[PDB]
Design an enzyme around this catalytic site. Structure first.
Site, PDB file in Angstrom:
ATOM      1  N   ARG A  58      20.035  59.279   9.071  1.00 59.00           N
ATOM      2  CA  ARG A  58      20.620  59.927   8.169  1.00 59.00           C
ATOM      3  C   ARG A  58      21.945  60.842   8.275  1.00 59.00           C
ATOM      4  O   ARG A  58      21.940  61.478   9.322  1.00 59.00           O
ATOM      5  CB  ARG A  58      19.487  60.733   7.323  1.00 59.00           C
ATOM      6  N   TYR A 100      21.183  70.147  10.926  1.00 56.82           N
ATOM      7  CA  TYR A 100      20.253  70.279  12.020  1.00 56.82           C
ATOM      8  C   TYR A 100      20.645  69.822  13.326  1.00 56.82           C
ATOM      9  O   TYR A 100      21.935  69.816  13.466  1.00 56.82           O
ATOM     10  CB  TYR A 100      18.982  69.752  11.568  1.00 56.82           C
ATOM     11  N   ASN A 113      22.641  67.357   7.570  1.00 58.27           N
ATOM     12  CA  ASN A 113      22.521  68.781   6.884  1.00 58.27           C
ATOM     13  C   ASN A 113      22.328  69.895   7.817  1.00 58.27           C
ATOM     14  O   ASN A 113      21.800  70.879   7.466  1.00 58.27           O
ATOM     15  CB  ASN A 113      20.985  68.472   5.909  1.00 58.27           C
ATOM     16  N   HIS A 147      16.980  62.102  11.487  1.00 57.74           N
ATOM     17  CA  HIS A 147      17.526  63.173  10.770  1.00 57.74           C
ATOM     18  C   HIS A 147      18.739  63.524  11.618  1.00 57.74           C
ATOM     19  O   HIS A 147      18.835  64.518  12.621  1.00 57.74           O
ATOM     20  CB  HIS A 147      16.743  64.299  10.604  1.00 57.74           C
ATOM     21  N   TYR A 150       9.583  75.433  -2.122  1.00 55.92           N
ATOM     22  CA  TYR A 150       8.820  76.128  -0.781  1.00 55.92           C
ATOM     23  C   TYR A 150       7.958  76.972  -1.192  1.00 55.92           C
ATOM     24  O   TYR A 150       8.220  78.111  -1.350  1.00 55.92           O
ATOM     25  CB  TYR A 150       9.857  76.552   0.104  1.00 55.92           C
ATOM     26  N   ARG A 160      15.708  66.054  -5.866  1.00 59.18           N
ATOM     27  CA  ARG A 160      14.767  67.027  -6.513  1.00 59.18           C
ATOM     28  C   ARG A 160      14.325  66.742  -8.330  1.00 59.18           C
ATOM     29  O   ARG A 160      13.322  67.080  -8.366  1.00 59.18           O
ATOM     30  CB  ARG A 160      16.037  68.367  -7.168  1.00 59.18           C
TER      31      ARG A 160
HETATM   32  C1  LIG Z   1      13.489  71.329  -1.779  1.00 59.94           C
HETATM   33  C2  LIG Z   1      14.239  70.219  -0.877  1.00 59.94           C
HETATM   34  C3  LIG Z   1      13.942  69.858   0.338  1.00 59.94           C
HETATM   35  C4  LIG Z   1      14.726  69.240   1.329  1.00 59.94           C
HETATM   36  N1  LIG Z   1      14.365  68.745   2.472  1.00 59.94           N
HETATM   37  C5  LIG Z   1      15.155  67.993   3.196  1.00 59.94           C
HETATM   38  C6  LIG Z   1      14.471  67.125   4.443  1.00 59.94           C
HETATM   39  O1  LIG Z   1      13.419  67.708   4.858  1.00 59.94           O
HETATM   40  N2  LIG Z   1      15.355  66.237   5.002  1.00 59.94           N
HETATM   41  C7  LIG Z   1      16.693  65.904   4.586  1.00 59.94           C
HETATM   42  O2  LIG Z   1      17.224  65.202   5.102  1.00 59.94           O
HETATM   43  N3  LIG Z   1      16.957  66.431   3.507  1.00 59.94           N
HETATM   44  C8  LIG Z   1      16.224  67.295   2.646  1.00 59.94           C
HETATM   45  N4  LIG Z   1      16.589  67.713   1.406  1.00 59.94           N
HETATM   46  C9  LIG Z   1      17.910  67.238   0.890  1.00 59.94           C
HETATM   47  C10 LIG Z   1      17.587  65.921   0.019  1.00 59.94           C
HETATM   48  O3  LIG Z   1      17.017  64.830   0.734  1.00 59.94           O
HETATM   49  C11 LIG Z   1      18.707  65.300  -0.841  1.00 59.94           C
HETATM   50  O4  LIG Z   1      19.831  64.808  -0.019  1.00 59.94           O
HETATM   51  C12 LIG Z   1      19.472  66.307  -1.847  1.00 59.94           C
HETATM   52  O5  LIG Z   1      18.392  67.082  -2.478  1.00 59.94           O
HETATM   53  C13 LIG Z   1      20.343  65.703  -2.756  1.00 59.94           C
HETATM   54  O6  LIG Z   1      19.870  64.907  -3.538  1.00 59.94           O
HETATM   55  P1  LIG Z   1      19.185  65.376  -5.185  1.00 59.94           P
HETATM   56  O7  LIG Z   1      20.423  65.910  -5.798  1.00 59.94           O
HETATM   57  O8  LIG Z   1      19.009  63.928  -5.823  1.00 59.94           O
HETATM   58  O9  LIG Z   1      18.382  66.324  -5.072  1.00 59.94           O
HETATM   59  C14 LIG Z   1      15.937  68.642   0.620  1.00 59.94           C
HETATM   60  C15 LIG Z   1      16.432  68.927  -0.623  1.00 59.94           C
HETATM   61  C16 LIG Z   1      15.606  69.804  -1.102  1.00 59.94           C
HETATM   62  C17 LIG Z   1      15.915  70.290  -2.674  1.00 59.94           C
END
Ligand SMILES: Cc1cc2nc3c(=O)[nH]c(=O)nc-3n(C[C@H](O)[C@H](O)[C@H](O)COP(=O)(O)O)c2cc1C
Length: 390
Positions: free
Chosen positions: A90, A43, A41, A38, A222, A195
Site C-alpha cells: 500500500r 507510517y 499514510n 503498509h 475509534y 468509511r
Molecule cells: C477510521 C479509519 C481508520 C483507518 N485505518 C487505516 C489503517 O489501519 N491502515 C491503512 O492503510 N489505512 C487506514 N485508513 C485509511 C483508509 O483505508 C482509506 O484509505 C481512507 O479512509 C479513504 O477511503 P474512504 O474515503 O473510502 O474512507 C483508515 C481510515 C479511517 C477513516
C-alpha cells in the site's frame, strides 16, 4: 524529551525486517490469504520514502533509490518468505497525513514511480506482487470529511504506465459512483471503500443496486465499544427499524453499479474475488490492552457482517508486527500466540462467508505515542532524528 525520536540503525532496520517476516508467517499459519505491507499514510515505511521525513545520509536516504530501500527490502523478504502471490503493497503518493510531503514536493511522483518500476522489474522476474493498493489524491488526509483535502494537482495514473498488475484504488468513492463507473473501465482496477464500509455492512449489495447509504458516526470510529462497530444495519434491517431518508446520507444520488466491471470476478493472489469492491484497512481500536489482542467480544461479528457478500476481499485493520512497531494500546498485533488465537477465529468467520482476508502489517514510526513506548521500555523510532511530526 523522555523518549526522544531515534534514527534507526541498519541493524534495527534488519530487526524490523525479521519481524515483518515472522508476522507474515504467523498470519498465513493462522489462515490469512495474504498480507499487505503498509507503506502509506505517513507510517514508518512512508517516513523512509518521503524526503521531508528522511534526511539520512547512509544507504537508506539521500536519493530516490536510497529512500525506497527499506520498503523494497520488506517486499523482497516477504516474497521470499511466503510467496509473491500472498504479498501486496500500500502506497499513498499524494498523502499529507502524518506530516508527509504530498504534491507540494516536486519530486514526489518520481519517488513513487521508482517504487512502481522496481515492482514491475520483480514482476518480470516472476515475482509479481498480488496487487498495489493506492490511496487516491481524492483523500490526502482520511480524517478530513469527503471532498476536503482533495488534491487537484496530481493523479495516480502514472502508476498504470509502470506497474502492470492489479491496482486497488481508495478514497471518497462511495459518494461518487460516477467516478467509479469510469475508473473500473480499466480491467485491472479494484475500488476500496473505507468509511462507508464502517457504516454499511452490506455495502456491496447497496453498490450493486444503487441503494441509499447509512451515515457513519465519526465519534465511534475509534472507541472501545460495540456501538458504532457491530450495530450498523443492513438496508433491509434499516427499513424494518423504520429508517427513512433522514437516517441515510442526505442528497446522495445512488447509481446501480451492477452493470460495470465492479461486479466482474477477478483473481487477486490465490483468491477468486466475485466482485471488485474491497474493504481497505480500517483501524478501529477495539483491541485489548494489555497485549494488543483482537477483541474477543465483537471483532468476529464485525468482520462476519462485512464478509456477508460472497467473494469479498477484506484487508484487516493495521496490525503491529512487534511491540516495538506499535504504540497504540488498542490496535491489534500479530506477534504473539494469544493474538493469533483470536485472529484465527476472525479468519474462520470470513472464510465461512466465502470471502477473503489479507492482514495489513503495520509499523508506526514517528506516528506512535512516545509515552506508551516509554512505559513499555521501547524506542520512539523514525528515519531521522532531526525532523519531527507536525
Ligand atoms: C477510521 C479509519 C481508520 C483507518 N485505518 C487505516 C489503517 O489501519 N491502515 C491503512 O492503510 N489505512 C487506514 N485508513 C485509511 C483508509 O483505508 C482509506 O484509505 C481512507 O479512509 C479513504 O477511503 P474512504 O474515503 O473510502 O474512507 C483508515 C481510515 C479511517 C477513516
Amino acid at each position: 524529551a523522555n523518549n526522544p525520536q531515534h534514527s534507526l540503525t541498519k541493524d534495527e532496520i534488519k530487526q524490523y525486517i525479521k519481524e515483518y517476516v515472522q508476522a507474515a508467517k504467523n498470519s498465513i499459519a493462522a489462515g490469512a490469504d495474504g498480507v499487505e505491507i503498509h507503506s502509506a499514510n505517513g507510517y514508518l515505511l512512508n517516513q523512509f520514502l518521503d524526503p521531508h521525513s528522511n534526511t539520512r545520509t547512509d544507504e537508506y536516504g539521500g536519493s530516490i533509490e536510497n529512500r525506497a530501500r527499506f520498503t523494497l527490502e520488506v517486499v523482497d523478504a516477504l516474497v521470499e518468505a511466503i510467496g509473491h502471490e500472498k504479498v501486496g503493497l500500500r502506497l499513498s503518493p499524494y498523502g499529507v497525513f502524518n506530516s508527509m510531503s504530498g504534491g507540494a514536493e516536486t519530486g514526489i511522483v518520481a519517488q513513487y514511480a521508482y517504487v512502481a518500476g522496481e515492482l514491475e522489474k520483480r514482476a518480470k522476474a516472476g515475482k509479481r506482487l498480488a496487487f498495489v493498493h493506492l490511496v487516491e489524491p481524492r483523500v490526502t488526509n482520511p480524517f478530513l470529511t469527503e471532498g476536503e483535502g482533495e488534491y487537484e494537482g496530481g493523479s495516480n495514473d502514472f502508476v498504470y504506465s509502470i506497474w502492470k498488475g492489479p491496482v486497488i484504488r481508495a478514497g471518497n468513492f462511495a459518494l461518487h459512483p460516477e467516478v467509479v463507473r469510469e475508473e473500473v473501465k480499466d480491467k485491472r482496477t479494484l475500488i476500496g471503500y473505507g468509511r462507508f464500509f464502517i457504516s454499511n455492512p452490506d455495502l456491496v449489495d447497496r453498490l450493486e443496486k444503487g441503494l441509499p447509504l447509512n451515515k457513519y458516526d465519526r465519534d465511534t470510529f475509534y472507541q472501545m465499544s460495540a456501538h458504532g462497530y457491530i450495530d450498523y444495519p443492513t438496508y433491509e434491517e434499516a427499513l424494518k427499524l423504520g429508517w427513512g431518508t433522514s437516517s441515510f446520507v442526505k442528497d446522495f444520488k445512488p447509481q446501480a453499479l451492477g452493470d460495470t466491471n465492479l461486479f466482474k470476478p477477478i483473481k487477486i493472489g490465490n483468491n477468486e474475488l466475485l466482485h471488485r469492491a474491497v474493504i481497505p484497512p480500517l483501524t478501529r481500536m477495539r483491541a485489548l490492552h494489555p497485549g494488543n489482542i483482537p477483541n474477543r467480544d465483537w471483532a468476529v461479528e464485525y468482520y462476519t457482517q462485512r464478509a456477508q457478500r460472497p467473494g469479498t476481499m477484506i484487508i484487516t485493520e493495521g496490525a503491529f508486527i512487534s511491540p516495538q512497531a506499535g504504540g497504540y494500546d488498542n490496535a491489534p498485533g500479530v506477534w504473539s500466540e494469544e493474538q493469533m488465537v483470536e485472529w484465527t477465529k476472525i479468519f474462520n468467520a470470513i472464510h465461512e462467508k466465502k470471502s477473503f482476508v489479507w492482514v495489513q502489517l503495520w509499523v508506526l514510526g514517528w506516528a506512535a505515542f512516545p509515552d506508551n513506548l516509554a512505559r513499555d521500555g521501547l524506542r520512539y523510532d523514525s528515519a531521522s532524528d532531526n525532523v519531527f511530526m507536525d
